[PDB]
Design a protein around this ligand. Structure first.
Ligand code: NA
Ligand code: NA
Ligand code: NA
Length: 157
DNA sequence: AGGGTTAGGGTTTGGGTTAGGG
């Protein structure tokens, strides 16, 4: 039952137990529900060290869940800058589209994570990428009344 | 129970559309 144990340790932030389970042959890309992998759970929850351990053990940086979301989508939307940075330096697809049409930049924009927006752009995020409703991150900033984010994105339009 | 950038967390317990458990 090592997959179940790994998923739990990764979401719960038990880095020691993650390392032990990986040493015992746990599948780094194990999934029990909704295509959720340990890296995706750790990235959404904010567990940086576990993200680092899983990547070192070969975790698929671009694994997708039931909604087509990659770990970078979750880290970007849930405001985990350092995880966003580690994922990107390890090959995360900055322009990955989920099944809702969103890129990580769309999620960072929707949730007001300016530093993440800037890091994504630094790593090549498509500023003109449109979601399912044909909206760009800039459009989202205007809809949400985010003056600071609109200022960052206006400078790049 | 119910919602959800949902997969835990808010007294408390099992739903779901894919669909378990303090
Ligand atoms: Na629930
Ligand atoms: Na649930
Ligand atoms: Na609950």
């Amino acid at each position: 039952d090592l997959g179940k144990k790994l998923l739990e340790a990764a979401r719960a932030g038990q880095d020691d137990e993650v390392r032990i389970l990986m040493a015992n042959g746990a599948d780094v890309n194990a999934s029990d529900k909704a295509g959720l992998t340990p890296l995706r759970l750790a990235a959404r929850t904010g567990h940086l060290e576990i993200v680092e351990v899983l990547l070192k053990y070969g975790a698929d940086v671009n694994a997708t869940d039931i909604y087509g979301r990659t770990p970078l989508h979750l880290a970007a939307g849930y405001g985990h800058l350092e995880i966003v940075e580690v994922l990107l330096k390890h090959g995360a697809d900055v322009n990955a589209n989920d099944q809702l049409g969103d890129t990580p930049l769309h999620l960072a924009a929707h949730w007001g994570h300016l530093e993440i927006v800037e890091v994504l752009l630094k790593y090549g995020a498509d500023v003109n990428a449109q979601d399912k409703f044909g909206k760009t991150a800039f459009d989202i900033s205007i809809d949400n009344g985010n003056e600071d984010l609109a200022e960052i994105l206006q400078k790049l339009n």
